[PDB]
Structure formats: structure tokens, C-alpha cells
Amino acid sequence: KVFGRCELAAAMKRHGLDNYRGYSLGNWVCAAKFESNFNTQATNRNTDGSTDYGILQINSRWWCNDGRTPGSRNLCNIPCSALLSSDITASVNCAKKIVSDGNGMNAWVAWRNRCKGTDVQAWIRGCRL
Ligand SMILES: Nc1ccc([As](=O)(O)O)cc1
Numbered sequence: 001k002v003f004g005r006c007e008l009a010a011a012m013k014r015h016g017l018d019n020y021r022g023y024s025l026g027n028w029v030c031a032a033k034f035e036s037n038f039n040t041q042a043t044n045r046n047t048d049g050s051t052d053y054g055i056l057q058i059n060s061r062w063w064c065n066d067g068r069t070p071g072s073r074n075l076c077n078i079p080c081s082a083l084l085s086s087d088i089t090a091s092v093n094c095a096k097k098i099v100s101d102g103n104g105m106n107a108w109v110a111w112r113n114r115c116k117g118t119d120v121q122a123w124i125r126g127c128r129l
């Protein structure tokens with residue numbers, strides 16, 4: 001599924017990401033835009049052999065099991081394919097675990113480089129939430 005901007009903002013809010021760990025909703029919408037282009041089916045291989053999955057490009061080295069990242073943890077206890085669903089529940093639950101992990105949203109390279117410190121409220125302008 002390719003989400004619309006306000007459509008994703010509504011979904012993330014309904015799942016309690018807004019202000020989760022102090023990160024306002026625009027942070028999560030911005031991250032999703034620059035990690036996946038709002039596409040739940042997005043996958044991208046990393047140099048280390050792991051792969052990033054879904055709307056928030058969750059990594060198989062630590063978070064989900066993709067059957068091919070030898071030496072990996074599956075801390076969200078989920079197959080990585082579950083993170084590609086049109087239903088973002090699994091991605092959201094796993095993201096809440098990641099953002100609690102210690103480095104907060106810095107875990108997401110696109111957020112750090114393209115969202116952090118910017119006017120992220122712009123990402124939810126016009127939405128009815
Ligand atoms: N903004 C953005 C554009 C393209 C992609 As991709 O799913 O092609 O790696 C991901 C994010």
C-alpha cells in the first residue's frame with residue numbers, strides 16, 4: 001500500500017505514535033516519507049547483508065527475521081514480511097520498541113539526515129487529526 005500523507009498521519013496517530021517518546025507526529029510522517037516514500041512494500045538491502053522492510057524500513061539484523069541475515073536478532077519477534085502489510089500495526093509496534101532502545105529516532109538514518117531539527121509540523125499541515 002502507498003499511503004497518502006494525511007492518511008498515514010491518521011493511521012500513525014490512531015496507533016499512538018503521535019508524541020510517542022516525545023516525538024511529535026510530523027517526525028514519524030517525515031521519517032516514513034524519506035525511508036519508504038510512504039510505501040509499505042518498500043525493501044532495501046544494506047551493505048552488511050541485512051535488509052530494511054516496510055513503511056519505516058525496519059532492519060533484519062536486529063528487529064525482524066527475514067531468513068537470510070545470518071547472525072541476527074529478531075527483537076520484535078516477527079517475520080520481516082509482516083512489516084510489508086497494508087496494515088501498519090506490526091511496523092508501529094516494532095518502531096515503538098526501536099525508538100525506546102537508547103538512541104531514539106536517530107536509529108532512522110533518513111530521519112536524522114532529513115527530518116531532525118526541521119519544521120516537521122509541515123508534514124501534518126492540512127490534515128484533520
Ligand atoms: N523518498 C524515498 C524515495 C524512494 C524510496 As525506495 O523504496 O525506491 O528505496 C524511499 C524513499
Ligand SMILES: Nc1ccc([As](=O)(O)O)cc1
Nearest residue numbers: 066067068069070071072
Ligand atoms: N544460515 C542462516 C541464514 C539465515 C538466518 As535468519 O536471518 O532467519 O536468523 C540465520 C542463519
Ligand SMILES: Nc1ccc([As](=O)(O)O)cc1
Nearest residue numbers: 023024026027119120121
Ligand atoms: N521550534 C519548534 C520545534 C519543534 C516543534 As514540534 O514538531 O515537537 O511540535 C515545535 C516548535
Ligand code: NA
Nearest residue numbers: 060064072073
Ligand atoms: Na533477524
